[PDB]
Amino acid sequence: FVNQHLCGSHLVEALYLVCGERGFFYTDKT
Amino acid sequence: FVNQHLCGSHLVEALYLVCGERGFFYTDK
Amino acid sequence: FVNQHLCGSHLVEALYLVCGERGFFYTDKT
Amino acid sequence: FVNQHLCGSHLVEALYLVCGERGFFYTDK
Amino acid sequence: FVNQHLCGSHLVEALYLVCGERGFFYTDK
Amino acid sequence: FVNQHLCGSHLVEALYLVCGERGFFYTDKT
Amino acid sequence: GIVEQCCTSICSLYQLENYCN
Amino acid sequence: GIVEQCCTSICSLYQLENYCN
Amino acid sequence: GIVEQCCTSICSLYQLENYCN
Amino acid sequence: GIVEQCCTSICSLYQLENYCN
Amino acid sequence: GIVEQCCTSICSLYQLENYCN
Amino acid sequence: GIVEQCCTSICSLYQLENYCN
Ligand SMILES: Cc1cccc(O)c1
Ligand SMILES: Cc1cccc(O)c1
Ligand SMILES: Cc1cccc(O)c1
Ligand SMILES: Cc1cccc(O)c1
Ligand SMILES: Cc1cccc(O)c1
Ligand SMILES: Cc1cccc(O)c1
Ligand SMILES: [Cl-]
Ligand SMILES: [Cl-]
Ligand SMILES: [Zn+2]
Ligand SMILES: [Zn+2]
Protein backbone atom coordinates (compact mmCIF):
# COMPACT_ATOMS: atom_id res chain seq x y z
CA PHE A 1 0.00 0.00 0.00
CA VAL A 2 1.10 3.68 -0.59
CA ASN A 3 3.20 5.50 2.00
CA GLN A 4 1.68 8.80 0.83
CA HIS A 5 -0.66 11.58 1.95
CA LEU A 6 -4.10 10.91 0.48
CA CYS A 7 -5.59 14.43 0.14
CA GLY A 8 -9.07 14.72 -1.47
CA SER A 9 -11.03 12.70 -3.97
CA HIS A 10 -8.01 10.46 -3.55
CA LEU A 11 -8.85 10.12 0.11
CA VAL A 12 -12.40 9.12 -0.79
CA GLU A 13 -11.40 6.96 -3.67
CA ALA A 14 -8.94 5.14 -1.40
CA LEU A 15 -11.60 4.56 1.22
CA TYR A 16 -13.88 3.40 -1.56
CA LEU A 17 -11.51 0.50 -2.43
CA VAL A 18 -10.09 -0.16 1.02
CA CYS A 19 -13.61 -0.60 2.39
CA GLY A 20 -15.48 -2.06 -0.56
CA GLU A 21 -18.66 -3.91 0.28
CA ARG A 22 -18.35 -2.77 3.94
CA GLY A 23 -18.81 0.88 2.85
CA PHE A 24 -17.60 4.05 4.57
CA PHE A 25 -18.05 7.39 6.31
CA TYR A 26 -16.43 10.62 5.23
CA THR A 27 -16.62 13.52 7.66
CA ASP A 28 -14.04 15.63 5.87
CA LYS A 29 -12.30 18.05 8.22
CA THR A 30 -13.13 17.85 11.88
CA PHE B 1 -19.79 -6.86 -10.57
CA VAL B 2 -17.86 -3.86 -11.94
CA ASN B 3 -20.20 -1.54 -13.69
CA GLN B 4 -21.77 -0.61 -10.46
CA HIS B 5 -18.36 -0.76 -8.77
CA LEU B 6 -16.77 1.42 -11.49
CA CYS B 7 -19.86 3.65 -11.37
CA GLY B 8 -19.59 4.10 -7.64
CA SER B 9 -16.02 5.23 -8.07
CA HIS B 10 -17.48 8.26 -9.67
CA LEU B 11 -20.26 8.79 -7.20
CA VAL B 12 -18.03 8.88 -4.19
CA GLU B 13 -15.80 11.39 -5.97
CA ALA B 14 -18.70 13.62 -6.96
CA LEU B 15 -20.30 13.25 -3.54
CA TYR B 16 -16.98 14.68 -2.35
CA LEU B 17 -17.14 17.81 -4.49
CA VAL B 18 -20.79 18.51 -3.67
CA CYS B 19 -20.84 17.60 0.02
CA GLY B 20 -17.85 19.80 0.78
CA GLU B 21 -17.42 19.78 4.52
CA ARG B 22 -20.75 18.27 5.65
CA GLY B 23 -19.47 14.80 4.70
CA PHE B 24 -21.34 11.74 3.53
CA PHE B 25 -21.93 8.08 4.27
CA TYR B 26 -21.40 5.67 1.50
CA THR B 27 -23.15 2.39 2.14
CA ASP B 28 -26.04 0.25 1.01
CA LYS B 29 -27.46 -3.19 1.78
CA PHE C 1 -19.96 22.36 -2.37
CA VAL C 2 -16.15 22.25 -1.65
CA ASN C 3 -14.36 25.32 -0.28
CA GLN C 4 -11.15 24.12 -1.96
CA HIS C 5 -8.75 24.97 -4.78
CA LEU C 6 -9.65 22.84 -7.80
CA CYS C 7 -6.29 22.47 -9.62
CA GLY C 8 -6.23 20.27 -12.76
CA SER C 9 -8.20 17.31 -13.98
CA HIS C 10 -10.14 18.13 -10.84
CA LEU C 11 -10.90 21.53 -12.27
CA VAL C 12 -12.19 19.91 -15.45
CA GLU C 13 -13.95 17.12 -13.70
CA ALA C 14 -15.70 19.68 -11.48
CA LEU C 15 -16.80 21.70 -14.47
CA TYR C 16 -17.94 18.47 -16.07
CA LEU C 17 -20.47 17.85 -13.24
CA VAL C 18 -21.30 21.45 -12.39
CA CYS C 19 -22.24 22.10 -16.02
CA GLY C 20 -23.60 18.76 -17.14
CA GLU C 21 -25.86 18.85 -20.17
CA ARG C 22 -25.03 22.58 -20.66
CA GLY C 23 -21.37 21.68 -21.35
CA PHE C 24 -18.26 23.82 -20.87
CA PHE C 25 -15.16 25.68 -22.03
CA TYR C 26 -11.69 25.16 -20.64
CA THR C 27 -9.07 27.71 -21.62
CA ASP C 28 -6.53 26.58 -19.04
CA LYS C 29 -4.17 29.39 -18.06
CA THR C 30 -4.80 32.81 -19.49
CA PHE D 1 -27.90 7.80 -18.98
CA VAL D 2 -24.59 7.04 -17.21
CA ASN D 3 -22.39 5.05 -19.47
CA GLN D 4 -21.93 7.99 -21.70
CA HIS D 5 -21.87 10.27 -18.64
CA LEU D 6 -19.29 8.06 -16.87
CA CYS D 7 -17.42 7.75 -20.19
CA GLY D 8 -17.29 11.49 -20.64
CA SER D 9 -15.75 11.82 -17.22
CA HIS D 10 -12.76 10.20 -18.73
CA LEU D 11 -12.77 12.13 -21.95
CA VAL D 12 -12.71 15.51 -20.32
CA GLU D 13 -9.83 14.36 -18.13
CA ALA D 14 -7.84 13.00 -21.06
CA LEU D 15 -8.69 16.03 -23.19
CA TYR D 16 -7.03 17.92 -20.33
CA LEU D 17 -3.75 16.02 -20.48
CA VAL D 18 -3.52 16.19 -24.28
CA CYS D 19 -4.77 19.73 -24.88
CA GLY D 20 -2.34 21.19 -22.36
CA GLU D 21 -2.66 24.93 -22.60
CA ARG D 22 -4.62 25.31 -25.87
CA GLY D 23 -7.83 24.37 -24.03
CA PHE D 24 -10.95 22.65 -25.28
CA PHE D 25 -14.71 23.00 -25.54
CA TYR D 26 -16.78 20.22 -24.23
CA THR D 27 -20.27 20.28 -25.65
CA ASP D 28 -22.60 18.48 -28.01
CA LYS D 29 -26.22 18.73 -29.11
CA PHE E 1 -13.47 -0.91 -27.19
CA VAL E 2 -14.04 1.38 -24.18
CA ASN E 3 -15.56 -0.56 -21.38
CA GLN E 4 -12.40 -2.44 -20.89
CA HIS E 5 -10.41 0.72 -21.66
CA LEU E 6 -12.48 2.79 -19.19
CA CYS E 7 -12.29 -0.13 -16.74
CA GLY E 8 -8.53 -0.29 -16.99
CA SER E 9 -8.35 3.38 -16.13
CA HIS E 10 -9.50 2.34 -12.74
CA LEU E 11 -7.29 -0.67 -12.41
CA VAL E 12 -4.09 1.18 -13.06
CA GLU E 13 -5.13 3.78 -10.49
CA ALA E 14 -5.99 1.18 -7.86
CA LEU E 15 -2.88 -0.84 -8.69
CA TYR E 16 -1.10 2.40 -7.81
CA LEU E 17 -2.62 2.73 -4.34
CA VAL E 18 -2.07 -0.93 -3.47
CA CYS E 19 1.35 -1.50 -5.01
CA GLY E 20 2.83 1.53 -3.27
CA GLU E 21 6.52 1.50 -3.99
CA ARG E 22 6.99 -2.05 -5.37
CA GLY E 23 5.55 -0.92 -8.71
CA PHE E 24 3.62 -2.84 -11.33
CA PHE E 25 3.60 -3.78 -14.99
CA TYR E 26 0.50 -3.08 -16.91
CA THR E 27 0.32 -5.13 -20.07
CA ASP E 28 -1.49 -8.01 -21.71
CA LYS E 29 -1.53 -9.74 -25.08
CA PHE F 1 0.26 17.88 -24.17
CA VAL F 2 0.49 19.30 -20.57
CA ASN F 3 3.59 21.19 -19.44
CA GLN F 4 2.90 20.07 -15.86
CA HIS F 5 4.26 17.81 -13.12
CA LEU F 6 2.34 14.54 -13.20
CA CYS F 7 2.50 13.36 -9.55
CA GLY F 8 0.62 10.13 -8.66
CA SER F 9 -2.42 8.35 -10.01
CA HIS F 10 -2.10 11.13 -12.56
CA LEU F 11 1.32 9.83 -13.46
CA VAL F 12 -0.13 6.35 -13.95
CA GLU F 13 -3.24 7.54 -15.65
CA ALA F 14 -1.10 9.57 -18.06
CA LEU F 15 1.06 6.57 -18.85
CA TYR F 16 -2.11 4.57 -19.28
CA LEU F 17 -3.25 6.81 -22.19
CA VAL F 18 0.14 7.75 -23.58
CA CYS F 19 1.02 4.07 -23.93
CA GLY F 20 -2.33 2.48 -24.66
CA GLU F 21 -2.20 -0.91 -26.33
CA ARG F 22 1.63 -0.96 -25.89
CA GLY F 23 1.19 -1.02 -22.08
CA PHE F 24 3.60 0.18 -19.39
CA PHE F 25 5.87 -0.24 -16.39
CA TYR F 26 5.60 1.73 -13.18
CA THR F 27 8.49 1.45 -10.76
CA ASP F 28 7.42 4.38 -8.61
CA LYS F 29 10.35 5.98 -6.82
CA THR F 30 13.80 4.70 -7.59
CA GLY G 1 -30.81 4.11 -3.28
CA ILE G 2 -28.00 6.22 -4.78
CA VAL G 3 -26.66 3.41 -6.85
CA GLU G 4 -29.88 2.11 -8.39
CA GLN G 5 -30.88 5.79 -8.92
CA CYS G 6 -27.56 7.33 -10.15
CA CYS G 7 -25.89 4.46 -11.83
CA THR G 8 -28.98 3.90 -14.09
CA SER G 9 -29.82 7.56 -14.85
CA ILE G 10 -27.48 10.53 -14.55
CA CYS G 11 -27.78 12.19 -11.14
CA SER G 12 -27.09 15.95 -11.45
CA LEU G 13 -25.19 17.67 -8.63
CA TYR G 14 -28.53 18.60 -7.17
CA GLN G 15 -29.74 15.00 -6.89
CA LEU G 16 -26.41 13.94 -5.57
CA GLU G 17 -26.59 16.60 -2.80
CA ASN G 18 -29.49 14.69 -1.40
CA TYR G 19 -27.16 11.99 -0.12
CA CYS G 20 -24.95 14.43 1.98
CA ASN G 21 -24.58 14.76 5.73
CA GLY H 1 -9.26 32.87 -15.64
CA ILE H 2 -11.02 29.78 -14.14
CA VAL H 3 -7.61 28.61 -13.20
CA GLU H 4 -6.65 31.91 -11.57
CA GLN H 5 -10.05 32.16 -9.86
CA CYS H 6 -10.43 28.44 -8.78
CA CYS H 7 -6.83 27.15 -8.53
CA THR H 8 -4.77 30.10 -7.37
CA SER H 9 -7.89 31.19 -5.26
CA ILE H 10 -10.89 29.06 -3.97
CA CYS H 11 -14.08 29.04 -6.05
CA SER H 12 -17.71 28.79 -5.21
CA LEU H 13 -20.20 26.77 -7.20
CA TYR H 14 -21.76 29.89 -8.83
CA GLN H 15 -18.28 30.96 -9.56
CA LEU H 16 -17.76 27.77 -11.45
CA GLU H 17 -20.89 28.01 -13.59
CA ASN H 18 -19.60 31.17 -15.05
CA TYR H 19 -17.60 28.84 -17.22
CA CYS H 20 -20.43 26.69 -18.56
CA ASN H 21 -21.46 27.09 -22.23
CA GLY I 1 -18.89 13.66 -32.38
CA ILE I 2 -16.36 12.86 -29.62
CA VAL I 3 -18.81 10.88 -27.60
CA GLU I 4 -20.30 8.69 -30.31
CA GLN I 5 -16.71 8.24 -31.64
CA CYS I 6 -14.72 7.77 -28.37
CA CYS I 7 -17.23 6.23 -26.09
CA THR I 8 -17.90 3.40 -28.64
CA SER I 9 -14.29 2.75 -29.77
CA ILE I 10 -11.13 3.70 -27.90
CA CYS I 11 -9.83 7.10 -29.00
CA SER I 12 -6.01 7.19 -28.74
CA LEU I 13 -4.36 10.44 -27.59
CA TYR I 14 -3.94 11.30 -31.23
CA GLN I 15 -7.66 11.10 -32.02
CA LEU I 16 -8.48 12.94 -28.88
CA GLU I 17 -6.11 15.81 -29.87
CA ASN I 18 -8.45 16.51 -32.71
CA TYR I 19 -10.99 18.00 -30.34
CA CYS I 20 -8.53 20.65 -28.85
CA ASN I 21 -8.51 24.42 -29.20
CA GLY J 1 -5.47 -11.93 -16.72
CA ILE J 2 -6.24 -8.81 -14.64
CA VAL J 3 -8.65 -7.43 -17.15
CA GLU J 4 -10.73 -10.52 -17.85
CA GLN J 5 -10.67 -11.19 -14.06
CA CYS J 6 -11.22 -7.64 -12.64
CA CYS J 7 -13.23 -5.99 -15.31
CA THR J 8 -15.87 -8.81 -15.17
CA SER J 9 -16.01 -9.29 -11.36
CA ILE J 10 -14.91 -6.80 -8.73
CA CYS J 11 -11.30 -7.39 -7.68
CA SER J 12 -10.83 -6.41 -4.00
CA LEU J 13 -7.55 -4.75 -2.99
CA TYR J 14 -6.31 -8.17 -2.03
CA GLN J 15 -6.83 -9.65 -5.51
CA LEU J 16 -5.39 -6.60 -7.09
CA GLU J 17 -2.20 -6.92 -4.95
CA ASN J 18 -1.50 -10.10 -6.81
CA TYR J 19 -0.51 -8.14 -9.89
CA CYS J 20 2.23 -6.03 -8.08
CA ASN J 21 6.00 -6.11 -8.46
CA GLY K 1 -9.84 12.96 11.67
CA ILE K 2 -9.14 10.82 8.53
CA VAL K 3 -8.08 14.00 6.91
CA GLU K 4 -5.76 14.99 9.76
CA GLN K 5 -4.41 11.43 10.02
CA CYS K 6 -4.09 10.66 6.21
CA CYS K 7 -3.71 14.09 4.58
CA THR K 8 -1.80 16.20 7.07
CA SER K 9 0.13 12.93 8.05
CA ILE K 10 0.67 9.65 6.01
CA CYS K 11 -1.70 6.74 6.65
CA SER K 12 -1.32 3.03 6.60
CA LEU K 13 -3.91 0.67 5.20
CA TYR K 14 -5.08 -0.45 8.69
CA GLN K 15 -5.22 3.16 9.55
CA LEU K 16 -7.61 3.68 6.71
CA GLU K 17 -9.99 0.86 7.61
CA ASN K 18 -10.69 2.54 10.86
CA TYR K 19 -13.03 4.62 8.77
CA CYS K 20 -15.04 1.82 7.17
CA ASN K 21 -18.66 1.28 8.31
CA GLY L 1 13.03 7.64 -12.65
CA ILE L 2 9.64 8.56 -14.25
CA VAL L 3 8.77 10.04 -10.95
CA GLU L 4 11.98 12.05 -10.70
CA GLN L 5 11.72 13.11 -14.36
CA CYS L 6 7.89 13.83 -14.46
CA CYS L 7 6.97 14.65 -10.84
CA THR L 8 10.01 16.39 -9.40
CA SER L 9 10.55 17.94 -12.95
CA ILE L 10 8.00 18.50 -15.85
CA CYS L 11 7.83 15.86 -18.59
CA SER L 12 7.13 15.99 -22.26
CA LEU L 13 5.04 13.42 -24.09
CA TYR L 14 8.12 11.76 -25.70
CA GLN L 15 9.62 11.77 -22.30
CA LEU L 16 6.69 9.79 -21.06
CA GLU L 17 6.78 7.12 -23.77
CA ASN L 18 10.19 6.16 -22.64
CA TYR L 19 8.30 4.24 -20.01
CA CYS L 20 5.99 2.25 -22.27
CA ASN L 21 6.62 -1.51 -22.67
C1 LIG M 1 -24.67 -0.10 -3.01
C2 LIG M 1 -23.73 -0.62 -1.94
C3 LIG M 1 -24.10 -1.75 -1.19
C4 LIG M 1 -23.26 -2.25 -0.19
C5 LIG M 1 -22.05 -1.60 0.08
C6 LIG M 1 -21.67 -0.47 -0.65
O1 LIG M 1 -20.49 0.15 -0.36
C7 LIG M 1 -22.51 0.03 -1.66
C1 LIG N 1 -22.42 14.77 -25.91
C2 LIG N 1 -22.94 15.97 -25.12
C3 LIG N 1 -24.17 16.55 -25.48
C4 LIG N 1 -24.66 17.65 -24.78
C5 LIG N 1 -23.91 18.18 -23.72
C6 LIG N 1 -22.69 17.62 -23.36
O1 LIG N 1 -21.97 18.17 -22.33
C7 LIG N 1 -22.19 16.51 -24.06
C1 LIG O 1 -5.34 -6.18 -21.45
C2 LIG O 1 -4.29 -5.42 -22.24
C3 LIG O 1 -3.81 -5.95 -23.45
C4 LIG O 1 -2.83 -5.29 -24.19
C5 LIG O 1 -2.33 -4.07 -23.72
C6 LIG O 1 -2.78 -3.53 -22.52
O1 LIG O 1 -2.26 -2.35 -22.07
C7 LIG O 1 -3.77 -4.20 -21.77
C1 LIG P 1 -21.47 12.42 -11.25
C2 LIG P 1 -22.07 11.09 -11.53
C3 LIG P 1 -21.18 10.05 -11.76
C4 LIG P 1 -21.67 8.78 -12.06
C5 LIG P 1 -23.06 8.58 -12.11
C6 LIG P 1 -23.95 9.64 -11.87
O1 LIG P 1 -25.31 9.41 -11.94
C7 LIG P 1 -23.45 10.91 -11.59
C1 LIG Q 1 -8.92 8.20 -22.85
C2 LIG Q 1 -10.28 7.71 -23.22
C3 LIG Q 1 -11.20 7.58 -22.19
C4 LIG Q 1 -12.47 7.11 -22.46
C5 LIG Q 1 -12.82 6.78 -23.78
C6 LIG Q 1 -11.89 6.92 -24.82
O1 LIG Q 1 -12.25 6.59 -26.11
C7 LIG Q 1 -10.60 7.39 -24.53
C1 LIG R 1 -10.69 -1.12 -8.02
C2 LIG R 1 -11.28 -1.77 -9.22
C3 LIG R 1 -11.60 -0.94 -10.28
C4 LIG R 1 -12.19 -1.48 -11.42
C5 LIG R 1 -12.42 -2.86 -11.48
C6 LIG R 1 -12.09 -3.70 -10.40
O1 LIG R 1 -12.34 -5.05 -10.49
C7 LIG R 1 -11.51 -3.14 -9.25
CL1 LIG S 1 -16.06 4.08 -16.43
CL1 LIG T 1 -3.17 16.51 -6.88
ZN1 LIG U 1 -14.77 5.44 -15.17
ZN1 LIG V 1 -5.07 14.80 -7.97
Side-chain angles (χ1 to χ4, degrees):
Chain A
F1 197 95
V2 291
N3 263 228
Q4 292 166 13
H5 299 248
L6 297 171
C7 253
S9 27
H10 305 297
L11 219 227
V12 169
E13 192 49 269
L15 279 173
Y16 182 52
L17 304 180
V18 155
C19 295
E21 31 180 59
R22 288 201 266 159
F24 77 101
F25 63 88
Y26 184 86
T27 60
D28 193 79
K29 288 175 286 311
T30 80
Chain B
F1 339 135
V2 299
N3 259 243
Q4 298 203 25
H5 193 74
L6 295 165
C7 184
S9 211
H10 292 229
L11 298 186
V12 318
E13 281 190 324
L15 271 188
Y16 173 71
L17 258 345
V18 47
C19 298
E21 302 191 330
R22 295 164 287 213
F24 55 105
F25 264 49
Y26 193 91
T27 25
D28 258 87
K29 201 176 177 273
Chain C
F1 197 95
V2 291
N3 263 228
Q4 292 166 13
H5 299 248
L6 297 171
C7 253
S9 27
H10 305 297
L11 219 227
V12 169
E13 192 49 269
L15 279 173
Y16 182 52
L17 304 180
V18 155
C19 295
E21 31 180 59
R22 288 201 266 159
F24 77 101
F25 63 88
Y26 184 86
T27 60
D28 193 79
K29 288 175 286 311
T30 80
Chain D
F1 339 135
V2 299
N3 259 243
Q4 298 203 25
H5 193 74
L6 295 165
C7 184
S9 211
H10 292 229
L11 298 186
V12 318
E13 281 190 324
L15 271 188
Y16 173 71
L17 258 345
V18 47
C19 298
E21 302 191 330
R22 295 164 287 213
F24 55 105
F25 264 49
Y26 193 91
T27 25
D28 258 87
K29 201 176 177 273
Chain E
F1 339 135
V2 299
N3 259 243
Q4 298 203 25
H5 193 74
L6 295 165
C7 184
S9 211
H10 292 229
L11 298 186
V12 318
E13 281 190 324
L15 271 188
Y16 173 71
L17 258 345
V18 47
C19 298
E21 302 191 330
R22 295 165 287 213
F24 55 105
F25 264 49
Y26 193 91
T27 25
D28 258 87
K29 201 176 177 273
Chain F
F1 197 95
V2 291
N3 263 228
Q4 292 166 13
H5 299 248
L6 297 171
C7 253
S9 27
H10 305 297
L11 219 227
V12 169
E13 192 49 269
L15 279 173
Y16 182 52
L17 304 180
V18 155
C19 295
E21 31 180 59
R22 288 201 266 159
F24 77 101
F25 63 88
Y26 184 86
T27 60
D28 193 79
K29 288 175 286 311
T30 80
Chain G
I2 200 173
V3 165
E4 187 224 352
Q5 272 39 246
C6 306
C7 295
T8 51
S9 1
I10 288 177
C11 288
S12 73
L13 282 201
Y14 301 93
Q15 272 141 315
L16 285 181
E17 198 159 27
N18 211 349
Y19 318 91
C20 292
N21 254 119
Chain H
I2 165 176
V3 166
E4 294 89 34
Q5 186 197 43
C6 314
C7 184
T8 67
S9 340
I10 54 219
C11 255
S12 74
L13 194 191
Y14 212 49
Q15 308 211 246
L16 270 174
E17 328 177 80
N18 283 134
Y19 304 88
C20 303
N21 286 101
Chain I
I2 200 173
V3 165
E4 187 224 352
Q5 272 39 246
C6 306
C7 295
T8 51
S9 1
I10 288 177
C11 288
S12 73
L13 282 201
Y14 301 93
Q15 272 141 315
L16 285 181
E17 198 159 27
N18 211 349
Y19 318 91
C20 292
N21 254 119
Chain J
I2 200 173
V3 165
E4 187 224 352
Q5 272 39 246
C6 306
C7 295
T8 51
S9 1
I10 288 177
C11 288
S12 73
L13 282 201
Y14 301 93
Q15 272 141 315
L16 285 181
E17 198 159 27
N18 211 349
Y19 318 91
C20 292
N21 254 119
Chain K
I2 165 176
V3 166
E4 294 89 34
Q5 186 197 43
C6 314
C7 184
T8 67
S9 340
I10 54 219
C11 255
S12 74
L13 194 191
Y14 212 49
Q15 308 211 246
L16 270 174
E17 328 177 80
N18 283 134
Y19 304 88
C20 303
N21 286 101
Chain L
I2 165 176
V3 166
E4 294 89 34
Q5 186 197 43
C6 314
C7 184
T8 67
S9 340
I10 54 219
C11 255
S12 74
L13 194 191
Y14 212 49
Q15 308 211 246
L16 270 174
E17 328 177 80
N18 283 134
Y19 304 88
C20 303
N21 286 101

